[PDB]
């Protein structure tokens, strides 16, 4: 295979698709993520996008994911948050509906993900100090 | 060993050296990488530099090199890009000539690297499901 | 050649009269007109 091109899905192409199908197009969204009145407005918008990106990277850095898109955690998933089958959410539900369905608990979820990793971090520490 | 002075290679001093010789001068370039009209122009220049560094960091972050300077990849190197011996491409060629040699295949390499890392993460997720 | 990406299987609740794009366009047009009239000469001696 030498005379073929490379074509991927466009920006937000899998917005209405399933979770399993939209999980393979996160790279394009991640890459697209990044007279003086006009200059001040443009620089303010660019800088605002910069703190939003750094805030997202900082929120991911406090967890056990140092930059990877897909990553697993050690905290258990509370069944009381959704009480639904994994097969039907990953095969018959988009990301928009899933986002508005659990829009409340995400914040407190982030908090456990954070402290948990904190104690988890010192876990390897009191083991790595045994060397 | 109390009056020992430490000096390193200068900024871009390993440009004319070989690939192996310039491979140990990456940290210096990485650390050195970072009235209203004058302020807005200098601010725009600094913001552009920060955005360029952010884009490069994100480019290395989407791959399996989130932070490490030297990293490998399971995808192989096809001879269509450059069919040269390892004994002479690392000891008889600089970074400038080598970059100008395969400058037309950088986008293809970047695309295959990102899709390979995406499928690698999917395979790792499926492996952790056992 | 601007990119046009169709988004199927999704419905967005569009609502005009509240969008900020028209307000920003009005502000930008006013600002551009004011900056365009800046290098022109004032007409103060006509009041006679």
């Amino acid at each position, epitope marked *: 295979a030498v*005379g*073929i*091109g*490379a074509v991927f*899905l466009g920006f937000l192409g899998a917005a209405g698709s399933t979770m399993g199908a939209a999980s393979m197009t996160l790279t394009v969204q991640a890459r697209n993520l990044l007279l003086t009145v006009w200059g001040i407005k443009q620089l303010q918008a660019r800088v605002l996008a910069v703190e939003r990106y750094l805030r997202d990277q900082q929120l991911l850095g406090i967890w056990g994911c140092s930059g990877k898109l897909i990553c697993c955690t050690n905290v258990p998933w509370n069944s009381s948050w959704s009480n639904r089958n994994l097969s039907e959410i990953w095969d018959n539900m988009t990301w928009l509906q899933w986002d508005k369905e659990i829009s409340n608990y995400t914040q407190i979820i982030y908090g456990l993900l954070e402290e948990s990793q904190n104690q988890q971090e010192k876990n390897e520490q009191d083991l790595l100090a045994l060397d | 060993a109390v009056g020992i002075g430490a000096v390193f290679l200068g900024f871009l001093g390993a440009a004319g050296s070989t690939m192996g010789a310039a491979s140990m001068t990456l940290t210096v370039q990485a650390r050195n990488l970072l009235l209203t009209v004058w302020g807005i122009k200098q601010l725009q220049a600094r913001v552009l530099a920060v955005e360029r560094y952010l884009r490069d960091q994100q480019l290395l972050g989407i791959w399996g090199c989130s932070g490490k300077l030297i990293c490998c990849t399971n995808v192989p190197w096809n001879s269509s890009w450059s069919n040269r011996n390892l004994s002479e491409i690392w000891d008889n060629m600089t970074w400038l000539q080598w970059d100008k040699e395969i400058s037309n295949y950088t986008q293809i390499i970047y695309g295959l690297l990102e899709e390979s890392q995406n499928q690698q993460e999917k395979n790792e997720q499926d492996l952790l499901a056992l | 050649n601007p*990119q046009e*990406i169709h*988004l199927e299987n999704v419905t967005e609740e569009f609502n005009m009269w509240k969008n900020n794009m028209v307000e920003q366009m009005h502000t930008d047009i006013i600002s551009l007109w004011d900056q365009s009239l800046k290098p022109c000469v004032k007409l103060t001696p006509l009041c006679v």
Partner: nanobody
Amino acid sequence: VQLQESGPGVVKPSETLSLTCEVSLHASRVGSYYWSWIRQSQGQRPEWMGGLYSDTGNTDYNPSLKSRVSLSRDMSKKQFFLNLRSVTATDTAVYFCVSRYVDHWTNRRFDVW
């Protein structure tokens, strides 16, 4: 995705032949397409002349046409040309503009002719 060749049907010998191929991209498949020109004579097997990518623009030509074929592209109007200098009597053939690109969404080849 549909392609359409265009150019002069009858040309005089010894000058440069110019052809243009209309390329219709997909709806939500932004990426890189590989455009190529393949000609086929009457009762003769087809032969690949040249190919090029839509992003970088690098071209690949046949080992017997370094001084005659010239590939060009323009993403503004989504059309790519073909310039064959020094046409001979053996150049009378049917020209086909093909597009090769792998679709990562459906794992298809989409070899449209």
